[PDB]
Nucleic acid binder design. Structure first.
Ligand SMILES: [Mg+2]
Ligand SMILES: [Mg+2]
Ligand SMILES: [Mg+2]
Ligand SMILES: [Mg+2]
Ligand SMILES: [Mg+2]
Ligand SMILES: [Mg+2]
Ligand SMILES: [Mg+2]
Ligand SMILES: [Mg+2]
Ligand SMILES: [Mg+2]
Ligand SMILES: [Mg+2]
Ligand SMILES: [Mg+2]
Ligand SMILES: [Mg+2]
Ligand SMILES: [Mg+2]
Ligand SMILES: [Mg+2]
Ligand SMILES: [Mg+2]
Ligand SMILES: [Mg+2]
Ligand SMILES: [Mg+2]
Ligand SMILES: [Mg+2]
Ligand SMILES: [Mg+2]
Ligand SMILES: [Mg+2]
Ligand SMILES: [Mg+2]
Ligand SMILES: [Mg+2]
Ligand SMILES: [Mg+2]
Ligand SMILES: [Mg+2]
Ligand SMILES: [Mg+2]
Ligand SMILES: [Mg+2]
Ligand SMILES: [Mg+2]
Ligand SMILES: [Mg+2]
Ligand SMILES: [Mg+2]
Ligand SMILES: [Mg+2]
Ligand SMILES: [Mg+2]
Ligand SMILES: [Mg+2]
Ligand SMILES: [Mg+2]
Ligand SMILES: [Mg+2]
Ligand SMILES: [Mg+2]
Ligand SMILES: [Mg+2]
Ligand SMILES: [Mg+2]
Ligand SMILES: [Mg+2]
Ligand SMILES: [Mg+2]
Ligand SMILES: [Mg+2]
Ligand SMILES: [Mg+2]
Ligand SMILES: [Mg+2]
Ligand SMILES: [Mg+2]
Ligand SMILES: [Mg+2]
Ligand SMILES: [Mg+2]
Ligand SMILES: [Mg+2]
Ligand SMILES: [Mg+2]
Ligand SMILES: [Mg+2]
Ligand SMILES: [Mg+2]
Ligand SMILES: [Mg+2]
Ligand SMILES: [Mg+2]
Ligand SMILES: [Mg+2]
Ligand SMILES: [Mg+2]
Ligand SMILES: [Mg+2]
Ligand SMILES: [Mg+2]
Ligand SMILES: [Mg+2]
Ligand SMILES: [Mg+2]
Ligand SMILES: [Mg+2]
Ligand SMILES: [Mg+2]
Ligand SMILES: [Mg+2]
Ligand SMILES: [Mg+2]
Ligand SMILES: [Mg+2]
Ligand SMILES: [Mg+2]
Ligand SMILES: [Mg+2]
Ligand SMILES: [Mg+2]
Ligand SMILES: [Mg+2]
Ligand SMILES: [Mg+2]
Ligand SMILES: [Mg+2]
Ligand SMILES: [Mg+2]
Ligand SMILES: [Mg+2]
Ligand SMILES: [Mg+2]
Ligand SMILES: [Mg+2]
Ligand SMILES: [Mg+2]
Ligand SMILES: [Mg+2]
Ligand SMILES: [Mg+2]
Ligand SMILES: [Mg+2]
Ligand SMILES: [Mg+2]
Ligand SMILES: [Mg+2]
Ligand SMILES: [Mg+2]
Ligand SMILES: [Mg+2]
Ligand SMILES: [Mg+2]
Ligand SMILES: [Mg+2]
Ligand SMILES: [Mg+2]
Ligand SMILES: [Mg+2]
Ligand SMILES: [Mg+2]
Ligand SMILES: [Mg+2]
Ligand SMILES: [Mg+2]
Ligand SMILES: [Mg+2]
Ligand SMILES: [Mg+2]
Ligand SMILES: [Mg+2]
Ligand SMILES: [Mg+2]
Lengths: 138, 175, 111, 80, 57
RNA sequence: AAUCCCCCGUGCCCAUAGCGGCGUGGAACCACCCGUUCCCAUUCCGAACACGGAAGUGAAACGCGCCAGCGCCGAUGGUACUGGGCGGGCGACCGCCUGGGAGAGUAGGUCGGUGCGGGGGA
RNA sequence: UCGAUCAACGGAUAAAAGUUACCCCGGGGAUAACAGGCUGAUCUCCCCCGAGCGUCCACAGCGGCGGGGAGGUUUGGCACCUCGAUGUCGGCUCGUCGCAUCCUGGGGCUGAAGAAGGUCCCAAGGGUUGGGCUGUUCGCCCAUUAAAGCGGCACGCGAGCU
RNA sequence: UCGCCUCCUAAAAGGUAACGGAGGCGCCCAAAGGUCCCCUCAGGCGGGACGGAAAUCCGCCGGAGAGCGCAAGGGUAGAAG
RNA sequence: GCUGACUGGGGCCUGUAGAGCACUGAUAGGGCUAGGGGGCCCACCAGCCUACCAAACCCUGUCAAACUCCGAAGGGUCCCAGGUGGAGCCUGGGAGUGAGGGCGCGAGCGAUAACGUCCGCGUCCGAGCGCGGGAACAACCGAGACCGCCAGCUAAGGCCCC
């Protein structure tokens, strides 16, 4: 689905969405990227919604990178009220300026119209990008 | 093929202002120098899209000297993804490490049209005497078959100068 | 293998001695000679010295040693030094090292 | 168990740490540092009790010493 | 020489150490001008409250 | 006797002293080395520790150099964050002032420095 | 120096469980049940995207996976006025308003020949049946109908009735 | 659920709540204690009858990841093993 | 009886924000490779191919309250100075309080709900339901009301008429 195997701890505190993406952010694997303009918990099921929209969009062809991963467990109570925490029930924290997704090996006009679909499945505003000198060398 | 920009100096003059000003803070340095400079953003941009830490940029700037720089850093701030500052490395004649682009030459040359092409590096890091700087590298290897990993020194090595290696890594492959 | 047995026991016995905080009567012994050097730490400083080298004596290495002890006491006691602690370094207290130490009383002592 | 709550414990805080800082005047007996491992070793005129606890041996002032991979050190300088 | 410090804005609702400060400049009512030496300690308090009192030399 | 240089101790800074490669040293120090009678040794072994030695060797170890492949150290500039003072946004969050200011990274640096004492040359 | 799951672990007695719709007093809106209020997970309705089904396909009619909201009619969360009292479901009587329109009026599109439908737009003037069953609200069912609309008003209305 | 220990929450002194997130104690040892002396791990690669992923042996590499009676933390081979 | 909050200088203590991936874990893409998933040639040790399994290892790329090779701003404490204040310390007499709330910032619980709940640091209401602004309004902005005045200057907020 997308999810770790093996966790150290089952549940973990919410924390803030403060700041800028802190890495990720420079477009390392592909010809075109999708970058986050807003912070959000992006869900294993939103990610896979986007991934499939793109493969469906081209031919089973192309190449797709993803590059954000849902390692943060997301609890919810049932309709109860208050005794303990839990349960269940996975997100990836995503700050502004991060490259998620990022396709390659496809025509610009394909990638861009697929990346546009892809971001319609996301809770945040997004930006399509290309690739650069600015994405350096390393 | 050959590139120059401009450059100016600065001492005080807070970066935020300069950056509001259409200009682009940066620094000039090398073993014998370190100096505070700025440039025009819109000007710099056009050049850097081209040069891109691959070709040499000769600056200009007042005095007027004209200084043979390699760009060795660009900090783009992550929110707007747009350069906030630039490192300009000035050459002198002592060997210096750097990034050379890569010319992949051929047809798929076996399993042609085709397997999958898979270029694993658009660059290589190489120690080079500034004087002779091999502005690209033709790499063909018409052997070019399914599954292999070409290492390093199997590259042309345009005449001037040696790898900054590692000699064993992954350049391309077909599958 | 890092940091040998020799250098462990070396450190081991020094450290213990160095806590009590007396002057240190340190003993080097080569296969040929035996030297002894009385140190004050925290000044990192040597005060009295005695060697089978600078005394140029020979024959029966143990008996040679008893002498460089008396040699040390005598020179040392002359500066006021009476109490110290026997370093014994990385050497079993025995034989040549024992002998220098029991030759180092008659003079400053407790060994 | 799992749900109701299996958690809920914690122990009392141990009020651990440094109790005298550099150049504070102390007297024989004053404990200088309260600590779990050997996180500071005893220095000049400084004892260590069985719970790893460091005290002044003599009246004086406390100096701190960072000896690199020899760890950190607390001494008391007399003029007691 | 000496500074002229005058209270221009109320301390009501600012942290207690910010009030404690105006006691060290011994400023009590609003508008109050006070004339005291420029030395670094008297300057520390004057700076701490600088969003309230305005200064002159 | 000061000064310098080499060795031997022994401190100190705590890797800029480290690893690896290479080279070098035996007169003197030092080591390995000769032996196991004696003191003393090995859950077996003189390996180690110990003694009595002095034929040989600097092979090992140690010391001294030189190499930047690794390791270690590492600016300046710019950001992040932030004491204090102000704004903006439904929110998540964001910006301005003034003061402090990393981490990663880039440029470089580095194959140690040094105190006391001896022994020997100066 | 010994006898403590005095473990409800600062340890009422050496020695102790239940029930009350037969109940009582003192208090509490410091605290539950009703209603309101905040909230809106849940619920109802929109909207974005648009895999896909629809012979073909402009989405005529559908609409996966995901996304953003509106409303405050549900089930809840909270515990804010009210416990020196804000009577609770349902029916009856009497209405009034909202519009997310059940009918009638006017529209566009259609995979609209006509007639008859489908879908969406405008529109709140008026209308919106009678019965069997159950306390029922709902719902099912009979016979009709232009239609047999969904909500709010302390789940409207007990100093109006039952 | 109720006392005790470890960690986090805890906002770089101490302290700090919730029917917040996770674990442990109610023992044990006459040696698992005192001292003197000695010794140094785990792991990996190579070699070696029965021997196998592992028994024991030999080589090199291995600054501590092992051990420290039991939870966790801190500490620790210049020893606390 | 100068020691006080606050402030200046100096030392020491710390492991948060940020960041990092050296540890513990998680983790995307590629490479190289143990064991095999056994296609099988065996059905003798063999045994090769892997667009599947794969340790470690290299390369690119990330994440963490209970990870840290690092690490600020600030914070604590001591010395020396300023600081005469409804300051400070000592002894003793009298209390009341031990339901708090809003808001800002930092966390947890909750749903990146609540005029939610629970801690931290500040503040204000409480007790300033006295005054001015915000239409009206405990806690938002302004500002600490001893009395009087048919005088002046300002704060926030305002200057078309009310
Ligand atoms: Mg990064
Ligand atoms: Mg969510
Ligand atoms: Mg309840
Ligand atoms: Mg979107
Ligand atoms: Mg604790
Ligand atoms: Mg105010
Ligand atoms: Mg303060
Ligand atoms: Mg280091
Ligand atoms: Mg010789
Ligand atoms: Mg010779
Ligand atoms: Mg040699
Ligand atoms: Mg650095
Ligand atoms: Mg800097
Ligand atoms: Mg600030
Ligand atoms: Mg830095
Ligand atoms: Mg080096
Ligand atoms: Mg030295
Ligand atoms: Mg000399
Ligand atoms: Mg009790
Ligand atoms: Mg109790
Ligand atoms: Mg207690
Ligand atoms: Mg009793
Ligand atoms: Mg009874
Ligand atoms: Mg009954
Ligand atoms: Mg009766
Ligand atoms: Mg009765
Ligand atoms: Mg009653
Ligand atoms: Mg009611
Ligand atoms: Mg209610
Ligand atoms: Mg009411
Ligand atoms: Mg809603
Ligand atoms: Mg709502
Ligand atoms: Mg809508
Ligand atoms: Mg309700
Ligand atoms: Mg209430
Ligand atoms: Mg409450
Ligand atoms: Mg009531
Ligand atoms: Mg009444
Ligand atoms: Mg009605
Ligand atoms: Mg309408
Ligand atoms: Mg109609
Ligand atoms: Mg019609
Ligand atoms: Mg129609
Ligand atoms: Mg028709
Ligand atoms: Mg109508
Ligand atoms: Mg109607
Ligand atoms: Mg009937
Ligand atoms: Mg009936
Ligand atoms: Mg029914
Ligand atoms: Mg009917
Ligand atoms: Mg209701
Ligand atoms: Mg009613
Ligand atoms: Mg009635
Ligand atoms: Mg009434
Ligand atoms: Mg009534
Ligand atoms: Mg920890
Ligand atoms: Mg703390
Ligand atoms: Mg704190
Ligand atoms: Mg603290
Ligand atoms: Mg338990
Ligand atoms: Mg081993
Ligand atoms: Mg083996
Ligand atoms: Mg350990
Ligand atoms: Mg432990
Ligand atoms: Mg343990
Ligand atoms: Mg531990
Ligand atoms: Mg004073
Ligand atoms: Mg200080
Ligand atoms: Mg963080
Ligand atoms: Mg890691
Ligand atoms: Mg952390
Ligand atoms: Mg650093
Ligand atoms: Mg004073
Ligand atoms: Mg008072
Ligand atoms: Mg009193
Ligand atoms: Mg009470
Ligand atoms: Mg209370
Ligand atoms: Mg409270
Ligand atoms: Mg704010
Ligand atoms: Mg509240
Ligand atoms: Mg709130
Ligand atoms: Mg408060
Ligand atoms: Mg009250
Ligand atoms: Mg007040
Ligand atoms: Mg009122
Ligand atoms: Mg008012
Ligand atoms: Mg008013
Ligand atoms: Mg008003
Ligand atoms: Mg008021
Ligand atoms: Mg007054
Ligand atoms: Mg007005």
């Amino acid at each position: 689905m997308l999810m770790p195997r093996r966790m150290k701890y089952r549940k973990q505190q919410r924390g803030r969405l403060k700041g800028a993406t802190k890495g990720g952010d420079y477009v390392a694997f592909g010809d075109y990227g999708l970058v986050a303009l807003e912070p959000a918990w992006i869900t294993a099921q939103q990610i896979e919604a986007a991934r499939v929209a793109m493969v469906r969009h081209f031919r089973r062809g192309g190449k797709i990178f993803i590059r954000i991963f849902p390692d943060k467990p997301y609890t919810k109570k049932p309709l109860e009220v208050r005794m303990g925490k839990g349960k269940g029930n996975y997100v990836a924290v995503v700050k502004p300026g991060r490259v998620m997704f990022e396709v390659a090996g496809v025509t610009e006009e394909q990638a861009m119209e697929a990346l546009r679909i892809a971001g319609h499945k996301l809770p945040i505003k997004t930006k399509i990008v290309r690739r650069d000198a600015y994405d350096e060398a390393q | 093929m050959e590139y120059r920009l401009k450059a100016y100096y600065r001492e005080g003059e807070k970066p935020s202002a300069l950056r509001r000003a259409g200009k682009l803070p940066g620094v000039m340095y090398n073993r014998h120098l370190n100096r505070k400079v700025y440039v025009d953003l819109v000007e710099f941009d056009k050049v850097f899209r081209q040069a891109s830490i691959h070709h040499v940029i000769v600056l200009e700037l007042p005095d007027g000297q004209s200084l043979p720089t390699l760009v060795r850093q660009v900090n783009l701030d992550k929110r707007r993804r747009r350069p906030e500052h630039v490192d300009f490395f000035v050459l002198s004649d002592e060997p210096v490490e750097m990034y050379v682009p890569l010319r992949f030459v051929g047809t798929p040359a076996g399993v042609r049209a085709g397997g999958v092409l898979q270029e694993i590096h658009r660059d290589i890091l190489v120690k080079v005497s500034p004087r002779n700087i091999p502005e690209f590298i033709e790499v063909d290897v018409s052997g070019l078959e399914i599954g292999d990993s070409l290492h390093a020194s199997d590259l042309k090595l345009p005449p001037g100068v040696e790898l900054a290696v590692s000699p064993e890594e992954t350049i391309a492959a077909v599958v | 293998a890092r940091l040998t047995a020799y250098e462990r026991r070396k450190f081991r016995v020094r450290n213990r001695i160095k806590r009590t905080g007396r002057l240190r009567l340190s003993v080097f012994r080569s296969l040929k000679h035996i030297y002894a050097q009385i140190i004050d730490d925290e000044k990192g400083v040597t005060l009295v010295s005695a060697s089978s080298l600078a005394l140029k004596l020979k024959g029966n290495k143990t008996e040679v040693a008893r002498q460089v002890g008396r040699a040390l006491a005598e020179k040392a006691l002359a500066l006021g030094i009476k109490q110290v602690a026997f370093d014994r370094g990385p050497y079993k207290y025995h034989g040549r090292v024992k002998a220098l130490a029991e030759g180092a009383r008659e003079g400053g002592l407790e060994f | 168990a799992l749900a109701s709550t299996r958690n809920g414990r914690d122990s009392q805080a141990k009020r651990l740490g440094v109790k005298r800082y550099e150049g504070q005047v102390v007297r024989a007996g004053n404990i200088l540092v309260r600590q779990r491992g050997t996180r500071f070793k005893p220095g000049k005129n400084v004892g260590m009790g069985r719970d790893f606890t460091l005290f002044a041996l003599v009246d004086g002032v406390v100096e701190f010493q960072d000896r690199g991979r020899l760890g950190r050190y607390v001494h008391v300088r007399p003029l007691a | 020489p000496r500074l002229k410090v005058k209270l221009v804005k109320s301390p009501i609702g600012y942290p207690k150490d910010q009030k404690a400060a105006l006691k060290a400049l011994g400023l009590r009512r609003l508008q109050q001008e006070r004339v005291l030496e420029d030395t670094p300690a008297i300057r520390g308090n004057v700076e701490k409250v600088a969003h309230l009192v305005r200064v002159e030399v």
